[PDB]
Amino acid sequence: KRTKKVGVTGKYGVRYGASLRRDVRKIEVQQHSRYQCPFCGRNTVKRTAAGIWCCNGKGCKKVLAGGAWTVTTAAATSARSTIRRLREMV
Amino acid sequence: FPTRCTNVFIGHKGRVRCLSVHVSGNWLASGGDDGVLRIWEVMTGRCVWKCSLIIQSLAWGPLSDSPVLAVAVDETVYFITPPIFSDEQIEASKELFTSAIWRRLHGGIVHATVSTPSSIKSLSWHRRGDYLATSSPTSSSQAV
Amino acid sequence: QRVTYRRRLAYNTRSNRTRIIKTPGNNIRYLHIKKLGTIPRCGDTGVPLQGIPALRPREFARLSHNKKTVQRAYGGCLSANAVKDRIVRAFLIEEQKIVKQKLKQL
Amino acid sequence: TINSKLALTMKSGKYVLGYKSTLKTLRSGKAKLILIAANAPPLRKSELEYYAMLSRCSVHHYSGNNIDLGTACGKLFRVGVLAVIDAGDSDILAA
Amino acid sequence: KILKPGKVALITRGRFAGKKVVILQAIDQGSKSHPFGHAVVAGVERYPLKVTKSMGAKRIARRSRVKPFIKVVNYNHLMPTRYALELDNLKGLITADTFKEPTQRSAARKTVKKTFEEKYQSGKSAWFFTPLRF
Amino acid sequence: PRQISDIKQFLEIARRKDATSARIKKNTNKDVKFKLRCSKYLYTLVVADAKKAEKLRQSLPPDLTVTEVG
RNA sequence: AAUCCGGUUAAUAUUCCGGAACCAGAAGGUGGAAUCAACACGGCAACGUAAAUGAAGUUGGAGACGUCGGCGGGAGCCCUGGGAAGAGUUCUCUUUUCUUUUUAACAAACCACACCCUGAAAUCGGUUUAUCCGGAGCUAGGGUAUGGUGUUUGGAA
C-alpha cells in the first residue's frame, strides 16, 4: 500500500485542504472506475465526458447517457421506477 | 492437312478424360471415368491392352528406353510399365526411382504409388524424366 | 549539414511537412511532402473500410472504379459486418410486420 | 427452479454453449431447448427465435444477464445463449 | 434439418449479399475441398423489374428477364427462411463435377434461368422474386 | 522510368510514331542498355548478351535516330 | 490538383539550360473487354480482377483536427569494421591520422493491427515496458486488407 488514506488524490499533494480533497477522492474513484455494460455484460464501460459512458466492447460500442461521475444515479433510478409504476397503472 | 477422321477407337463405356502417345508413337494410352486403361496401336487400331487396373490424366515418360506411364486416379498416382514393351525396357524403367507418401492383376506391373492430400488434376513430366509435377485445384498452398 | 525550406513558408505547419533526401549530387535537402491519406470509414460502425487505399480526397478520382469499392451490397460504404446486420435485421423485421398483419387482420 | 433444472441438465444430459454452437445445433435440428440471456442483442435474440421456430424448438429468455446465466451454469465465463440437446435426468423440456 | 433442398434462404456474405436463394443440395457433412457444412444454392442476381398493366408486351418481357446465379455457400453465411420454392426440373443438375467443369456450370445456369423465367411468369413465389430492401 | 523486359514490344514502341530517338549504353559490367526516347516515357531494355544486342540494333528500323553512348 | 535531379550567371532560379516526370481539362482515333441469357467472373468467406452502363432523389465517407506519456518501425545525421585513391606526421612510435567513397521526383514488381474461415476453451489460457482479451467463439492452423521515408530494378552514371 503506497498511500494509506489519500488514494487517487495523492497527485494533488498537500494543497486544497483535507476535506476538500476527500470528497474529490470519492467522486474521482467513481469517475475513473470501469462499469459493467448493461447491454453486453463486459466490464468495458468507461467515462468519456461528463454524462457520457462509452462501451469499448468489440461488437457493443454502445454509448450511454448517465451521471457526471457514475453511470447510474439514485435520482435517475428513482425516476425510472416511478415512471415504470405509473405506466403500468395507466 | 489434318483432314477428316479415318480411324475410330471404340470400347470406352464413358468419357475418355485423357490420352497420351508414347515417344515411339506406336502406343496410345487412354483413360477416363470408367477407370479402364486402354493401350492402342495406331497402325491397326486394336486395343491389345484391355487391363483396367476415375482416371484424371496420364502421361508417358520422355525417355524412350524407359517407357513408364504415370496415371492419376483420384489422389493416387501410379507409375505403370506395361509388359507390352521388351523386357530390357522394364529393367531400364526401374532404376529411375528404385510430403506425398510413396509406396512400392492381368499384367499388373506396378512400380510406385504416390498418395496426395488432394485429387491430382494435371500431370507434367520433366525432359529428363526425374521430376513429376502434379497439380490439384482444390488445395492452395500445396496445390502443385 | 543543415537544410532550409524550399518554399517561402517558414513555421512548420500541417502543410509545411518535409522530408530529408540525399541527392545524386551528395546533398542533404528537404523534400516538401503532402499529408497522408485516410481509408474511408464505415457509415454505421465507423470502422475503416477494407479493400480501399488511403489517399487524399482528390487523389481518389484517379483510381479505377473497382479500386475504390468492394463488390458487395453497400460495398465501399459499409463494412461486411454492418451489411450483414442490415440484411438480417431487414429480413427479421419484415417477417414481423407480416406476422403482425396476419394477427390483426383476423 | 429454472436454475436447479439447468444445473442438473448439464450434469445429466447433453448441452452446447455459446452462439455458434447453439446456432449449429438448431440448424442440424437436434436442439430441443434454447436458453437466451437477458442482455442478448435484440437482433441476435430475434434471429435465434427465427431459427427456433423453423426447427420447432422451445425458447426460454433467462431473466438474469449473460454473466448470471454462466454463473448458474457454474462455468466461470459469461454465456449469452446455450442449446439443450438432451435433458437427461432433468425434465427441463416439459417445464 | 432446416436447411433442406427446396428451402428459400438469404445469402448474408459474399458478392451476392442479401439475395434470395433456394437450397439446391445440402452437404452438411462436409467435403475434402469444403471441410465445412456447405450447401449449393441457386439464386437471383438481377431481380426482374416491376411491371405495370399499362406496359406493352415487349417491355413486359424486357423487364421480366431475370439473371440467375449458382453458388456453394457456407451454412453460417446462409440465413434460412420459412418460405419454400418448388424446384421442379431442378432436382438433379448440380454435382461436384458440375462445378469442376464450367460447361456443366454454364448449362446449370441456363437451366436455372429458364426455370426462374417460367416460374416468374406463372406468378408463383412472389416473395422469392421480389428484391429485399435493406 | 519504364523498364521493358520484352524485346519485341521494345521494337514495336520503337516503330511507333511517338518514338523520336534511341540511345545505346555500354556499361563496364558488360551489359547493353537500349533506351528509347518516346513522347511521354523513356523505355529502356537491358540485355546481357552482346550478339543479341547487336542483332537487336540492326533490327531497329533505319528511320529511327540511334545515338551511341553519351 | 500537379516537379525532381544535375548544371548555368558578375547578379536570377524547385522559374533559365540539359535530362527526367506529373496534374487538370478537351476531343475524336487505335487496341482490349462486356453485350440478342442487354448491363463480367472468381472465393465458403474477409475480398480480388485490365475493363465490368446507372438519370432524378437520398445517404455515407474523406477534407476534419486537443494534450501529455512512454514503446515499436523508417529515413537523414552520428558512431564504426575492411577496400581503394590522394594528402598530414614520422629523431622515435603508430597495418594510422584526415578527406573522398553520393543516388532525386516518378514508373514497375514485392513486402504481416483490423477482419474472415475451421474449431470449441477450467489443470483457464493468450499477451504488454505499461492487464487488457476471449462461449458476443480464446489459444492454435490457414487466409484477406492496408504497402513506404522498405526492398529489387528503371531514372542512372
Curated annotation (Swiss-Prot), chain B:
Subcellular location: Nucleus, Nucleolus; Nucleus, Nucleoplasm
Domain of life: Eukaryota
WD repeat locations: 11-50, 115-144
Family note: Belongs to the WD repeat BOP1/ERB1 family.
Subunit structure: Component of the NOP7 complex, composed of erb1, ppp1/nop7 and ytm1/SPAC890.04c. The complex is held together by erb1, which interacts with ppp1/nop7 via its N-terminal domain and with ytm1/SPAC890.04c via a high-affinity interaction between the seven-bladed beta-propeller domains of the 2 proteins. The NOP7 complex associates with the 66S pre-ribosome.
Function: Component of the NOP7 complex, which is required for maturation of the 25S and 5.8S ribosomal RNAs and formation of the 60S ribosome.
Protein name (Swiss-Prot/TrEMBL): Ribosome biogenesis protein erb1
Gene this protein is translated from: erb1
Residues of the full protein shown: 371 to 555 of 740
Curated annotation (Swiss-Prot), chain C:
GO biological process terms on file: cytoplasmic translation; ribosome biogenesis
Location(s), subcellular: Cytoplasm
Pfam families per the UniProt record, alphabetical: Ribosomal_L34e
Coarse class of the protein's main subcellular location: cytoplasm
Domain of life: Eukaryota
Annotated GO CC locations: cytosol; cytosolic large ribosomal subunit; preribosome
Matches recorded under InterPro entries: Ribosomal_eL34, Ribosomal_eL34_C_sf, Ribosomal_eL34_CS
GO molecular function, one term: structural constituent of ribosome
Keyword entries, A-Z: Cytoplasm, Ribonucleoprotein, Ribosomal protein
Bilayer-spanning residue ranges: none
Role noted for this protein: Component of the ribosome, a large ribonucleoprotein complex responsible for the synthesis of proteins in the cell. The small ribosomal subunit (SSU) binds messenger RNAs (mRNAs) and translates the encoded message by selecting cognate aminoacyl-transfer RNA (tRNA) molecules. The large subunit (LSU) contains the ribosomal catalytic site termed the peptidyl transferase center (PTC), which catalyzes the formation of peptide bonds, thereby polymerizing the amino acids delivered by tRNAs into a polypeptide chain.
Family as reported in the entry's similarity comment: Belongs to the eukaryotic ribosomal protein eL34 family.
Note: There are 2 genes for eL34 in S.pombe.
Subunit relationships: Component of the large ribosomal subunit (LSU). Mature yeast ribosomes consist of a small (40S) and a large (60S) subunit. The 40S small subunit contains 1 molecule of ribosomal RNA (18S rRNA) and at least 33 different proteins. The large 60S subunit contains 3 rRNA molecules (25S, 5.8S and 5S rRNA) and at least 46 different proteins.
Gene this chain is encoded by: rpl3401
From Swiss-Prot, chain D:
GO biological process, one term: cytoplasmic translation
Membrane-spanning intervals of the chain: none
Organism domain of life: Eukaryota
Record keyword Ribonucleoprotein present: yes
GO molecular function annotation: RNA binding; structural constituent of ribosome
Additional comment: There are 2 genes for eL30 in S.pombe.
Subunit: Component of the large ribosomal subunit (LSU). Mature yeast ribosomes consist of a small (40S) and a large (60S) subunit. The 40S small subunit contains 1 molecule of ribosomal RNA (18S rRNA) and at least 33 different proteins. The large 60S subunit contains 3 rRNA molecules (25S, 5.8S and 5S rRNA) and at least 46 different proteins.
This protein's name: Large ribosomal subunit protein eL30B
Gene behind this protein: rpl3002
UniProtKB/Swiss-Prot annotation, chain E:
Biological-process GO terms, alphabetical: cytoplasmic translation
Keyword Kinase recorded: no
One GO cellular component term noted in the UniProt record for this chain: cytosol
Family annotation (InterPro entries): KOW, Ribosomal_eL27, Ribosomal_eL27_CS, Ribosomal_eL27_KOW, Ribosomal_eL27_sf, Translation_prot_SH3-like_sf
Subcellular location: Cytoplasm; Nucleus
Superkingdom in the source lineage: Eukaryota
Gene3D superfamilies: 2.30.30.770
Protein keywords: Cytoplasm, Nucleus, Ribonucleoprotein, Ribosomal protein
Matches recorded under PROSITE patterns: RIBOSOMAL_L27E
Gene Ontology MF annotations: structural constituent of ribosome
Miscellaneous section: There are 2 genes for eL27 in S.pombe.
Family affiliation: Belongs to the eukaryotic ribosomal protein eL27 family.
Stated role: Component of the ribosome, a large ribonucleoprotein complex responsible for the synthesis of proteins in the cell. The small ribosomal subunit (SSU) binds messenger RNAs (mRNAs) and translates the encoded message by selecting cognate aminoacyl-transfer RNA (tRNA) molecules. The large subunit (LSU) contains the ribosomal catalytic site termed the peptidyl transferase center (PTC), which catalyzes the formation of peptide bonds, thereby polymerizing the amino acids delivered by tRNAs into a polypeptide chain.
Subunit structure and binding partners: Component of the large ribosomal subunit (LSU). Mature yeast ribosomes consist of a small (40S) and a large (60S) subunit. The 40S small subunit contains 1 molecule of ribosomal RNA (18S rRNA) and at least 33 different proteins. The large 60S subunit contains 3 rRNA molecules (25S, 5.8S and 5S rRNA) and at least 46 different proteins.
